[PDB]
């Protein structure tokens, strides 16, 4: 009559199965030092078909596809992520579902976003362009760090999943959250949004709260240098409607009790500390997103957008 209920979601369970399988398969294939053109058009497909052989945590009919496995393994290596840590981060403990289809890893190092067939097509277009860029900058970017790309099939229903390094902290929680475009038009969080514990604020909210960012000229000249060449790369690709995602962690408010002889096992690669002498001690998490890569459940000329965007972001400091 009504829909079926499960203790474990099928899609997620197949996904974590597939990642295990794919990293296991990859450990038996020496990583090339040089990627070839064909690697950007490569895929791994597996179809499981069990008759009358019933499992709890896993359906009986399902498919898993990994896109460009040698490319993403190479990206992981350039971003300083060993396949074993990736696998552990994603499978050891189950991932926490956040808001439609958007997952954080138990350790909070990785984010997993469901995306469209359309978005997979876009990913493939610029993947070789992106890999070239990552080589040039030695993985030092404010762009998303794409670590894997997969299609899960349950019920004859294809879900596309994208794995990214978390722009936010492996533990330091985020108190204030902005999406900034520097748009000619006004941008503001709805009444329905400011109603949430962590609402996605915007350009007018930032200005209306006279919000600034205090980091210190040296960490600023390091940030704006990187931001410029990242945005220049996006111009070459004729990409436009992107934002700076800005997370503020307030030091004094601190973390929940579940943060004696324990050191952080991960680095927050988009994090930058309050410089000495500043209204409040804080950590800033700043990276580049668009509608495709926004930390949310998926629902004018490039050079102008660029010049404009860099104008607005240079003024938040
Ligand atoms: N190598 C590729 N290069 C560019 N776009 C691709 C590539 N593979 C898939 N796409 C696109 O990405 C989206 C997802 O395609 P997908 O569901 O993987 O189809 P498929 O590979 O043609 N099917 P199948 O043979 O069953 O694996 C669609 O928009 C595809 O056209
Ligand atoms: C450079 C870009 C990150 C990228 C890398 C690898 C492979 C593909 C892409 C890409 N990224 C899109 N959006 C996501 C996005 C854009 C800007 C900033 C942050 N995130 C794309 C396309 C094509 C259309 N769109 C909307 N290509």
What SS3 string covers 120-163?
HHHHHHHHHHHHHHHHHHCCCCCCCCEEEEEEEEECCEEEEEEE
Query: Encoding tokens for residue 123?
Result: 């990913």
Integer Cα distance of 220 and 205 in angstroms: 22
Is residue 287 classed as helix, strand or coil in its secondary structure?
strand
Note the Cα 223 to chain centre separation in Å: 19
Distance from Cα 68 to the centre of ligand 1, integer Å = 11
Integer Cα distance of 54 and 62 in angstroms: 13
Residue with tokens 């038996």: 28
Distance from Cα 123 to the centre of ligand 2, integer Å = 6
Residues with CB under 6 Å of ligand 2 are 122-123, 125-127, 130, 143-144, 146, 234, 239, 242, 288-290, 292-293
Query: Encoding tokens for residue 42?
Result: 């490569």
Angle between helices 217-236 and 302-314 (to 10 degrees): 170
Distance from Cα 121 to the centre of ligand 1, integer Å = 7
Nearest to 124 by CA among 65, 36, 40, 230: 40
Integer Cα distance of 203 and 180 in angstroms: 5
C-alpha torsion sign, points 247, 251, 253, 259: positive
Nearest to 172 by CA among 279, 294, 273: 273
Closest residue by Cα to atom 10, ligand 2, is 123
Nearest to 268 by CA among 75, 107, 148, 97: 107
Distance from Cα 301 to the centre of ligand 1, integer Å = 29
Query: Encoding tokens for residue 33?
Result: 């030092």
Query: Encoding tokens for residue 55?
Result: 């499992």
Integer Cα distance of 159 and 153 in angstroms: 6
Integer Cα distance of 7 and 260 in angstroms: 35
Start-end of CATH 3.30.810.10 domains in the chain: 176-315
Closest residue by Cα to atom 18, ligand 1, is 151
Q: Residue 37 burial by CB count (10 A; 0-12/13-18/19+): exposed, middle or buried?
A: exposed
The answer to whether 203 and 186 are in contact (CB under 8 A) is yes
Residues with CB under 6 Å of ligand 1 are 41, 45, 65, 117, 120-121, 124, 151, 158
CA Rg value for the chain: 21
The answer to whether 17 and 29 are in contact (CB under 8 A) is no
Query: Encoding tokens for residue 94?
Result: 């189950």
Integer Cα distance of 94 and 126 in angstroms: 31
Given in angstroms, what resolution was this structure solved at? 2.0
Number of DSSP helices (H) and strands (E) in the chain, helices first: 8, 12
Integer Cα distance of 165 and 111 in angstroms: 6
Residue with tokens 């601190």: 254
Nearest to 100 by CA among 20, 57, 174, 160: 160
**What amino acid positions are annotated as catalytic residues?**
113, 241
Closest residue by Cα to atom 11, ligand 1, is 121
Cβ-count burial 38-73 (b if 16+ within 10 Å, e if not):
ebbeeebeeebeeeeeeeeebbeebbbbbbbbbbbb
Start-end of CATH 3.30.800.10 domains in the chain: 10-165
Cβ partners under 8 Å of residue 223, min gap 6: 142, 215, 272, 286
Query: Encoding tokens for residue 83?
Result: 């396949």
Whose atoms come closest to the Cα of 288: which ligand?
2
The answer to whether 106 and 251 are in contact (CB under 8 A) is no
Residue with tokens 């896109």: 67
The answer to whether 119 and 230 are in contact (CB under 8 A) is no
Query: Encoding tokens for residue 164?
Result: 């990214």
Q: In what order do the strands lie in the sheet with 271-273?
A: 200-201, 176-180, 243-250, 282-289, 271-273
Count CB neighbours of 85 within 10 A: 16
CATH class of the structural domain 176-315: alpha beta
Nearest to 187 by CA among 239, 241, 254, 252: 241
Query: Encoding tokens for residue 207?
Result: 């200005």
Angle between helices 217-236 and 117-137 (to 10 degrees): 130
Counting from 1 in the atom list of ligand 2, the atom nearest the Cα of 289 is 19
Closest residue by Cα to atom 5, ligand 1, is 121
The method recorded for this entry reads X-ray
Q: What is the CATH number of domain 10-165?
A: 3.30.800.10
Integer Cα distance of 35 and 38 in angstroms: 8
């Amino acid at each position: 009559k009504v829909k079926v209920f499960r203790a474990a979601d099928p899609l997620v369970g197949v996904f974590l199965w597939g990642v295990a399988h794919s990293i296991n398969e990859l450990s038996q294939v020496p990583p090339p030092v040089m990627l070839l053109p064909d690697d950007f058009k490569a895929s791994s497909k597996i179809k499981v078909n069990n008759h009358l052989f019933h499992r709890e945590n896993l359906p009986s009919h399902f498919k898993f596809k990994e896109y460009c496995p040698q490319v993403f393994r190479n990206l992981r290596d350039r971003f300083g992520i060993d396949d074993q840590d990736y696998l552990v981060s994603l499978t050891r403990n189950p991932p926490s579902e956040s808001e439609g289809r958007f997952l954080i890893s138990y350790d909070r190092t990785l984010v997993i976003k469901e995306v469209s067939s359309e978005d997979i097509a876009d990913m493939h277009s610029n993947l070789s362009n992106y890999h070239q860029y990552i080589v040039k900058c030695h993985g030092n970017t404010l762009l998303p760090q794409f670590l894997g790309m997969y299609r899960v099939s349950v019920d004859n229903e294809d879900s596309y999943m994208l794995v990214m390094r978390n722009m936010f902290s492996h533990r330091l929680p985020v108190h204030r959250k902005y999406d900034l475009k520097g748009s000619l038009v006004s941008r503001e969080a709805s009444d329905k949004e400011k109603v949430k514990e962590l609402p996605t604020l915007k350009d007018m909210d930032f200005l209306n709260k006279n919000q600034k960012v205090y980091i210190g000229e040296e960490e600023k000249k390091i940030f704006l240098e990187k931001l410029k060449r990242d945005v220049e790369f996006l111009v070459q690709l004729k990409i436009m409607d992107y934002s700076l995602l800005l997370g503020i962690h307030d030091i004094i408010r601190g973390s929940e009790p579940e943060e004696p002889g324990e050191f952080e096992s991960f680095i927050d690669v988009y994090a930058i500390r309050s410089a000495e002498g500043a209204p409040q001690k804080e950590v800033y998490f700043m990276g580049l997103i668009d509608i495709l890569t926004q930390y949310d459940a998926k629902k004018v000329h490039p050079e102008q957008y660029a010049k404009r965007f860099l104008d607005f972001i240079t003024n938040i400091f």
